[PDB]
Amino acid sequence: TPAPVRYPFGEAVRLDLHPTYAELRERRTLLRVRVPHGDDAWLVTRHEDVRTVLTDPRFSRAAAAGRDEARLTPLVIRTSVMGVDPPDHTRLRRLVATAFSRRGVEHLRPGITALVRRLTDDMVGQGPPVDLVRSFVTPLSGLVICDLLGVPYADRSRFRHWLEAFFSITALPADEVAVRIEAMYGYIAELVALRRAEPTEDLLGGLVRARDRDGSCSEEELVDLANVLLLAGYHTTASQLASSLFVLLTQPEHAELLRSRPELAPRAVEELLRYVPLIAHVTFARYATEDVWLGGTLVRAGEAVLPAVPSANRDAEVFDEPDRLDLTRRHNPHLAFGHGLHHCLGASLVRVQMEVALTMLLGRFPDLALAAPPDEVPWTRGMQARSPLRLPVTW
């Protein structure tokens, strides 16, 4: 075995990718790395290779629960359906599959559309400058997931504080991480109790009824599933949208192109998903459960692999001019939502929020531009998903 290389190669800076990813793809080899916590791993950088570790059955995500799992976070996160194999993965995802399907999410489009109008109504009447993150991005994805899930949006003052700790690499000490995480699990348990004697017409109410009258999940499985859905809808989506807004505001000829032809929006959303490196470094580790050869390496049973999804999304053997934003690309087999068995449950929900938000924003503010130099936009530091912390704009 090679002497392991330090990983992360460095701090993730704005939306730039480290040069080592490009070199690794060309070499066609995995890199033995030593990560901030847990086992050593293999880093996987090519598209065809990230596809394999994400969904090949010889690579297990449940096996990582029985290990000191190779990770960037000080504490192992319970990842609900993202951390299990079949048959447990089937049984749990069955319980949420229909509400997140494309036809299911389409029934929310009038409400998201109505919400985006309310939010931009307010920008129009307040006048520039506006922090686009505070006045648009966080309300939108916050209110959409809170209404769908049942979580009180008015409770964001208390639970938004604990949300950060599930994403923290270096931003929080391990003790503060354990305190917030347990505070978050108590708060979800609060809401679940509320549904036992007052049922609700929302996703959380459906999940308690599936536990209480079908016994399809344990009580902790219910709480983990509720937490992951709130993390991904409140934080991961607002990070991608703010990042996508940064790209369009600093590459404004592409903004103007999307604005002048708003029917590109479905292609522009997929391309903004491919091009934006949302994942700061890597997604969740897999452990091989038998010997697997790939990237010049026989990965042995018991060994960890780390999929570098943003690097796969720049792979020159799948995407023409991969490092150039092409909002018109027609076929776009990106891995920004994962691949295969654990492909992102909220995929359609994110698409519809992004198409609607980008269309109205560009439409209602044809002269929209940043109100500060792109280099002085501040960025989240030491977190698992990249995002601007403020997006000052004018029009």
Ligand code: HEM
């Ligand atoms: C732009 C926003 C988002 C992005 C870029 C994104 C990305 C991803 C990726 C890359 C994976 C696969 C991870 C892996 O295999 O290591 C994943 C899985 C998942 N995502 Fe998201 N996601 C987003 C928003 C959401 C939303 C809004 C929800 C739900 C409300 C959600 C729920 C889930 C779940 C439950 C899984 C695990 C699915 C399974 O295990 O079958 N995500 N996501």
